[PDB]
Amino acid sequence: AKKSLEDLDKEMADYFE
Amino acid sequence: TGFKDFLLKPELSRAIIDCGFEHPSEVQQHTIPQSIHGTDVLCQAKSGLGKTAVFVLSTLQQLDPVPGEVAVVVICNARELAYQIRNEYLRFSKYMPDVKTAVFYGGTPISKDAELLKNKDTAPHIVVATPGRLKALVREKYIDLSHVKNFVIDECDKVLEELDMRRDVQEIFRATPRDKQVMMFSATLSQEIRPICRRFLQNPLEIFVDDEAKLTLHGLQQYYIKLEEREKNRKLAQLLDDLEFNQVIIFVKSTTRANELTKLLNASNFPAITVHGHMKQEERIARYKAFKDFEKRICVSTDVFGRGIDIERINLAINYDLTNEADQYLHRVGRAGRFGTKGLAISFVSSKEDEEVLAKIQERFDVKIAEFPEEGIDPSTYL
RNA sequence: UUUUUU
Ligand SMILES: Nc1ncnc2c1ncn2[C@@H]1O[C@H](COP(=O)(O)OP(=O)(O)O)[C@@H](O)[C@H]1O
Ligand code: BEF
Ligand SMILES: [Mg+2]
């Protein structure tokens, strides 16, 4: 139940807009 | 006083003069002037040529302290490195009484960090930390990072390739304003980690050493010894009796081998200390200071001291156990010969991968790591 | 294994 390398790119994409 | 040409605060320039600095290194000349403007920085420079002073002096110049408000955050990979970086902030903020700094890492009660964060005498404007504890401060809202203007990641290649540190750093990075300056530093920024870095920068100034043949310090003599595991103890004891070193760092691949090797060194009239995980942080720091303040000339440690640690008396680094990949080797040997001074590195090759990893180091950096001559080496060639 | 909150 911990984040994949997948999702960490997706969180930072969402962070910048 | 070459730093005065950067047109820095009089309190900064005065503290820089008390630190013996008089000529900026090439990385500081290429990074500081344009970092002062808030431009994002992705910086690569060889080991020990002064990347800390880049983001330390830069953030201190842009900083205008607002009481109780964290403006600058610096992330590293090791606890003692964070302690070292915070001590550099203390020495350059010597004549800035308004500035307050704090460092946070594991091994200490988090409730005390919470109290230190609320106190009006200790509420920091600049926070240095390891990713684990700083995330545990953001998520329990002991710290407020809604006002960060400068975000620094030191040893960024290690911080972002280890994925537990990347999650924490990205959780911390999402509690900060998006319109902040972000700076990243490392002696090793391979082609595979730079795209991952760029997802935190916005039109950054990028300083690289792409011809990685001068990521090797010319003043660092590198040798290897091909031996068997049962011969390491007697060969190391002989090396420490014959070679003429000021202080030596000995890198081991595990904590059990660190404590057992250090115990045998102290038994054989080789006074040594050891620093690694699995140890109370009260004890890790106590020995760090004992070795840093020259009470013992020998330190055995894991990769906890592989990166960032700066002790000027280290002119001998011994890879008792070799690393798995070349990048960690370059940081390891970088602990010796700080700021382009003379140094000597010797690695033990006791198995098959020591030979392929030693094989893969030489193409990456152009260095011929010669086999240690059986007749020994001249003291002048590394003094 | 080594580094990183408990
Ligand atoms: N311009 C300078 N003049 C003199 N000494 C310096 C200068 N810049 C850095 N140093 C010293 O060199 C040592 C290594 O610096 P550091 O920032 O740790 O290198 P890096 O971060 O590139 O590994 C530090 O102890 C620092 O005091
Ligand atoms: F490049 Be230094 F050793 F952090
Ligand atoms: Mg450094």
Residue numbers in the entry:
A (entry chain H): 208 to 224
B (entry chain A): 62 to 444
Provide excerpts from the study.
The evolutionarily conserved TREX (TRanscription-EXport) complex, which facilitates assembly of export competent mRNPs and functionally connects transcription with nuclear export, is a key player in these events. The TREX complex in yeast consists of the hetero-pentameric THO complex, the DEAD-box ATPase Sub2 and the mRNA-binding protein Yra1. The Sub2 ATPase, belonging to the DEAD-box family of RNA-protein complex remodeling enzymes, is central for these TREX-mediated reactions. Here, we report crystal structures of two relevant assemblies to provide insights into the mRNP-remodeling reactions carried out by TREX.
Second, a 2.6 Å structure of Sub2 bound to an ATP analogue, poly (U) RNA, and a C-terminal fragment of Yra1 showed the two lobes of Sub2 in a closed configuration. Within this Sub2•Yra1-C*•RNA complex, Sub2 adopts a closed conformation with ADP•BeF3 and 6-nt of RNA (U1 to U6) bound in between Sub2-N and Sub2-C. The RNA is sharply bent between U4 and U5, as observed in structures of other RNA-bound DEAD-box ATPases. Likely due to flexibility, electron density of the C-vr region and 9-nt of RNA is missing in the crystal structure. Sub2, like other DEAD-box proteins, predominantly interacts with the phosphate-ribose backbone of RNA, with Sub2-N and Sub2-C contacting the 3’ and 5’ ends, respectively. Notably, the RNA binding C-vr region of Yra1 that precedes C-box is located close to the RNA, which raises the possibility that it could extend the RNA-binding site in the Sub2•Yra1-C•RNA complex. L215D or D216K mutation was introduced on Yra1 to, respectively, disrupt the hydrophobic or polar interactions at the Sub2-Yra1 interface. We found that both mutations abolished the stimulatory effect of Yra1-C. Taken together, we conclude that Yra1-C exhibits a bipartite interaction, with the C-box binding to Sub2-N and the C-vr binding to RNA, both of which contribute to Sub2 activation. The ADP•BeF3-trapped stable trimeric complex of Sub2, Yra1-C, and RNA, represents a key snapshot for the ATP-dependent recruitment of Yra1 by Sub2 that occurs on the mRNP.
